[PDB]
Amino acid sequence: NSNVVTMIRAGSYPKVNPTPTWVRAIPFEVSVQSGIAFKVPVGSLFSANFRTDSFTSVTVMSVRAWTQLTPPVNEYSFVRLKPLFKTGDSTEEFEGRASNINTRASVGYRIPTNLRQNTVAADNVCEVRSNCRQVALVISCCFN
Amino acid sequence: NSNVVTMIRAGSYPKVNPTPTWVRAIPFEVSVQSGIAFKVPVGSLFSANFRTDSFTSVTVMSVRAWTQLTPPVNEYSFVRLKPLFKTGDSTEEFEGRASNINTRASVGYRIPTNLRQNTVAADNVCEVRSNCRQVALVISCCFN
Amino acid sequence: NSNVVTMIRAGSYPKVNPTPTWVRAIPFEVSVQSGIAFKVPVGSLFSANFRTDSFTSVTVMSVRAWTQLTPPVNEYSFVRLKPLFKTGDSTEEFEGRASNINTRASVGYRIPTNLRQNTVAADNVCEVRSNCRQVALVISCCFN
Amino acid sequence: NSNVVTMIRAGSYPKVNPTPTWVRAIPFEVSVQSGIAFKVPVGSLFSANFRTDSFTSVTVMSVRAWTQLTPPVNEYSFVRLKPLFKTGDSTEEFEGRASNINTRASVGYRIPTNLRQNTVAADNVCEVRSNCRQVALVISCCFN
Amino acid sequence: NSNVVTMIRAGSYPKVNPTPTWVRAIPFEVSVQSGIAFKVPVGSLFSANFRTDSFTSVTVMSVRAWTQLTPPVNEYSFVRLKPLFKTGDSTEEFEGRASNINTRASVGYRIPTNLRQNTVAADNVCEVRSNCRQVALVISCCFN
Amino acid sequence: NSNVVTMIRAGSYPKVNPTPTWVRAIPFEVSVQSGIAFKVPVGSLFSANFRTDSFTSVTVMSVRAWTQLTPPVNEYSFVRLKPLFKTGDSTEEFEGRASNINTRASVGYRIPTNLRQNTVAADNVCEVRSNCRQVALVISCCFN
Amino acid sequence: NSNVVTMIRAGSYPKVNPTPTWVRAIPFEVSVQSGIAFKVPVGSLFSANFRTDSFTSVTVMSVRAWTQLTPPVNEYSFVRLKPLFKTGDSTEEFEGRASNINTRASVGYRIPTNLRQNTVAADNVCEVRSNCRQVALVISCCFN
RNA sequence: AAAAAAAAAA
RNA sequence: AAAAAAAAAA
RNA sequence: AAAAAAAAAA
RNA sequence: AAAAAAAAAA
RNA sequence: AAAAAAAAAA
RNA sequence: UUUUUUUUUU
RNA sequence: UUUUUUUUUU
RNA sequence: UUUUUUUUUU
RNA sequence: AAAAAAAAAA
RNA sequence: AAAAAAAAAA
RNA sequence: UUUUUUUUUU
RNA sequence: AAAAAAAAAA
RNA sequence: AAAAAAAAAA
RNA sequence: AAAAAAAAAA
RNA sequence: AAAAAAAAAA
RNA sequence: UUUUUUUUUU
RNA sequence: UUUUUUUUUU
């Protein structure tokens, strides 16, 4: 392949965008209490730890949850997800349980195209329920 | 297609990365004096206006320049580019001229694979010469 | 086929959901006055008569209306539907008339994918106008 | 695809049903004592927690059991299932055992077509035996 | 072809709609100040000058902009667009610049299907920035 | 498909039209007396109830008529149409009768290409005769 | 398929057998001491708990062994099997060891066709050795 | 036959 | 790949 | 048509 | 060649 | 697609 | 993708 | 007979 | 190996 | 393989 | 040759 | 889906 | 698809 | 399958 | 024939 | 074309 | 022999 | 990709 700089025959000035969109998967954790549902805020996706402090809106595509800490004694890990939306919250409780006490419990859900609108920091993604004190999330989204 | 949320049978916790790389084309402008060469610093690529204030290094792939203002009276626009490298500056003067007085002049150059190392904010990209007082650049690079 | 019980060789604990979604066609009637449009509330879909008193939101896909009672003397039955949306009500008046005085008049409309968001009990499906005193509806939707 | 509402050319009033059937897999847990068989009541399937409080009968198709808590010390988890029927109870003890002490034990059985009749709340599904104090069940059935 | 009136063998009365939908491209201009962003109201699309004064909602599909006046002295024409949405404003700045000082600058963006909801007169389409005092807009939309 | 806004690489300013044409079918009713022909005015097609109050001319392609009320006692429904033209009125009497006393009568005619000129509000479409007091008309026309 | 009873045109009285053979895999456990071989008696296969109390002889085809309890501290589980025969005992010590301290150790041996004679309750099947205090056996055999 | 630099071409 | 329920389709 | 980044898939 | 609007058709 | 110069190659 | 100049490899 | 949702089997 | 986003080449 | 009765089906 | 139960197998 | 055992049908 | 009336055509 | 309206495309 | 939801399957 | 009942047949 | 108008058959 | 349940289209 080429070993030195080569000339580019550029033409007219193209169309540019200094602030483009970005498809990303954001990993973060949430602290949950026993028997209490925790509304996960959308504002947790806008942070300098994800290079996403420049955005103000995001389109969430899918949500995946993992238990982050060990379950109580004699129990297996479980994590539930209840989707939330601005036009109307859902009543599904997608639950995944671990079959080994030393293994995480995982579950997720996909958001259909008809409900993939923008969300801002004040909004909530879903509700999380678990017997472990911490839940890790991996949210596939498009920042715009 | 689907009209409601559907469960995702997630498995083990996957390999994640909260601060990934990003291939971009960064547009920005510089002020140039007549008969004086302007050194374009690499620090101009790290800004919040480009969503890039979180990176510290960047791999430049190609540089393109356009004249941003009108040329002096009776003249046609022109722009020269001299590539600069930490291992050793080059002496090429890639020059493009305008064939219409009302049209921009443009030129660009490609950096070969053997010279695509990282550069930090303190480094320089190239030298810019032009008869117009402002030059527009679009630098294709990989942030990491 | 099998005549007695057979053993299932199960494995790990699967991903479960106790409150799943449900695509339905909900029949119900509304009383209409002469020359006055009636806003059909979405809350009519959540009732124990439909096994749907557990849902809080619903995604309406298509609405079909029939005249339920006989028209006034010397007239043929008719029914008009005007779709309503939270992001902006429409002005279309889909209308159907009966060609026999003793037959029902019917009409319906389809909701596109871009407008298939969730609606709650406080929302309205559409406006209905009819010279008959009652109108039967069959609203294809997805409860979630 | 369409971006606005389109008219449906509906015809006569169709055959309707406001309370239809539903095939579901219902997850719930039962408390088991050591060396004592526990009868699983059919009434545990009718609940507002499963959106099935509107049904009174149910046709059971298959039953799957998992150990929900840890086994006693030094032991591996096990679970036994004995199908119960109104016309005549079976004596099969379908058993599954865990090969890892930290993993659930699971087993299941399928009800043939000749035994798929309706059952009410008073009826029993099966007897469960386990060295663990809790057993999670997932019953595939059709509500009607 | 036929040179006189011929009889149509019509049948039953069909499904009619007096106020139908309408796919349109609405051209109009806005006044922009130097260095000041201008929010384009959706109400600009409802006017008797476009035959659309009878509509109350509209679904936008794409937005296009051209510079309507000459840029300041020594400068090339440019125009920036930032899409706005009720669910969440975007941060993109789609920019197009003129390569000839006598030529307009043009740029545009397309709204995805998942963001094509209804918008009323009080809503805003996008922000516009330009060094020219007037920008010509052409908005492909569906009236309903 | 796309989930976020994407940039359109627009070019020169295109040919636009703010007040375009429109192919429509305009449904409306007229009051007819027994044994008296009624001239249908073209001005009935220009109204805000049809979104066509902005037009001043219209080109008719075909005319259809149904009886809107019940016929007198012991009689079957009928309707006659006589096309009218500015260059010369026709003498045809396209007639359709009901085979059931409870059913509407329908008939229609098509205007050839050589007679499809513009018509203003002062002009008349056709004469209508019927034993019923009201006749429903559906006129396929092109507004311009 | 047939929904009521049908007539069977039987012929002569067939050859019957009220006490037929039966191929089975008998699950049972034995208690084993440390460093002491345990002779598993054939009489353990004849029991009402396996529906085989009516048999007096059995033809053993294969023997499989699993550890039933946890091994000593710091040790992995293991189990040995030594086949025994009335015509002459074997000296093979088929051994299996667990590769996880929390998993069962398993091994098995198949009896060839030339050594598949009948064995009564007084006979032995194999000698079992293990560091666990219990071994779970599953013996494939034909009861006759 | 492919690859690099300088030049040329549709 | 076939079958059941709920929904949609030619 | 190939390659790079991010995402998604069998 | 495909997608959306209005009209028409088997 | 061919030709020249500098370089690399089977 | 090829022709030519410098160079290399085989 | 297929698309889609819940679920199961492989 | 393809689809999608950013970008370049042609 | 055809025919009859009763039932079910495209 | 297909269906069932029990066992076994790739 | 097959091999084996018990039984049935043809 | 053929025939009849009026018209038009190679 | 063809014709008209509005939108889009090579 | 394709798509959706609930279930079942290799 | 398949399935049920009664009848009939190789 | 076809196209068009009126009309009938299917 | 198919079978079943609700439903739609043809």
PDB file of N, CA and C (backbone and C1' of nucleotides) in Angstrom, chain F residues 23-25 64 140, chain K residues 5-9:
ATOM      1  N   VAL F  23     -57.367  15.815  -7.799  1.00  0.00           N
ATOM      2  CA  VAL F  23     -58.430  14.910  -8.222  1.00  0.00           C
ATOM      3  C   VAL F  23     -59.234  14.507  -6.993  1.00  0.00           C
ATOM      4  N   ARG F  24     -60.555  14.655  -7.070  1.00  0.00           N
ATOM      5  CA  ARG F  24     -61.418  14.404  -5.926  1.00  0.00           C
ATOM      6  C   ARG F  24     -62.717  13.758  -6.382  1.00  0.00           C
ATOM      7  N   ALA F  25     -63.409  13.147  -5.422  1.00  0.00           N
ATOM      8  CA  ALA F  25     -64.810  12.768  -5.562  1.00  0.00           C
ATOM      9  C   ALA F  25     -65.579  13.490  -4.470  1.00  0.00           C
ATOM     10  N   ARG F  64     -72.356  10.543 -10.484  1.00  0.00           N
ATOM     11  CA  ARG F  64     -73.115   9.416  -9.965  1.00  0.00           C
ATOM     12  C   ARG F  64     -74.168   9.915  -8.987  1.00  0.00           C
ATOM     13  N   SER F 140     -66.856  12.705  -9.541  1.00  0.00           N
ATOM     14  CA  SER F 140     -65.416  12.584  -9.729  1.00  0.00           C
ATOM     15  C   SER F 140     -64.930  13.736 -10.599  1.00  0.00           C
TER      16      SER F 140
ATOM     17  P     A K   5     -50.943   6.583   1.592  1.00  0.00           P
ATOM     18  O5'   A K   5     -51.315   7.982   0.927  1.00  0.00           O
ATOM     19  C5'   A K   5     -51.504   9.144   1.722  1.00  0.00           C
ATOM     20  C4'   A K   5     -51.862  10.338   0.876  1.00  0.00           C
ATOM     21  C3'   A K   5     -53.106  10.189   0.012  1.00  0.00           C
ATOM     22  O3'   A K   5     -54.310  10.435   0.723  1.00  0.00           O
ATOM     23  C1'   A K   5     -51.337  11.021  -1.306  1.00  0.00           C
ATOM     24  P     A K   6     -55.545   9.410   0.612  1.00  0.00           P
ATOM     25  O5'   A K   6     -56.337   9.891  -0.684  1.00  0.00           O
ATOM     26  C5'   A K   6     -56.976  11.159  -0.729  1.00  0.00           C
ATOM     27  C4'   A K   6     -57.085  11.664  -2.145  1.00  0.00           C
ATOM     28  C3'   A K   6     -57.842  10.766  -3.115  1.00  0.00           C
ATOM     29  O3'   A K   6     -59.250  10.911  -3.056  1.00  0.00           O
ATOM     30  C1'   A K   6     -55.776  11.318  -4.059  1.00  0.00           C
ATOM     31  P     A K   7     -60.190   9.613  -3.191  1.00  0.00           P
ATOM     32  O5'   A K   7     -60.144   9.251  -4.743  1.00  0.00           O
ATOM     33  C5'   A K   7     -60.801  10.064  -5.705  1.00  0.00           C
ATOM     34  C4'   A K   7     -60.415   9.682  -7.112  1.00  0.00           C
ATOM     35  C3'   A K   7     -60.843   8.297  -7.576  1.00  0.00           C
ATOM     36  O3'   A K   7     -62.189   8.244  -8.008  1.00  0.00           O
ATOM     37  C1'   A K   7     -58.574   8.631  -8.114  1.00  0.00           C
ATOM     38  P     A K   8     -63.029   6.883  -7.856  1.00  0.00           P
ATOM     39  O5'   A K   8     -62.335   5.877  -8.879  1.00  0.00           O
ATOM     40  C5'   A K   8     -62.446   6.076 -10.280  1.00  0.00           C
ATOM     41  C4'   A K   8     -61.590   5.106 -11.057  1.00  0.00           C
ATOM     42  C3'   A K   8     -61.915   3.630 -10.891  1.00  0.00           C
ATOM     43  O3'   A K   8     -63.038   3.213 -11.648  1.00  0.00           O
ATOM     44  C1'   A K   8     -59.584   3.935 -10.734  1.00  0.00           C
ATOM     45  P     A K   9     -63.918   1.960 -11.155  1.00  0.00           P
ATOM     46  O5'   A K   9     -62.988   0.696 -11.441  1.00  0.00           O
ATOM     47  C5'   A K   9     -62.578   0.386 -12.765  1.00  0.00           C
ATOM     48  C4'   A K   9     -61.496  -0.667 -12.799  1.00  0.00           C
ATOM     49  C3'   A K   9     -61.842  -2.023 -12.210  1.00  0.00           C
ATOM     50  O3'   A K   9     -62.642  -2.812 -13.074  1.00  0.00           O
ATOM     51  C1'   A K   9     -59.672  -1.378 -11.516  1.00  0.00           C
TER      52        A K   9
END
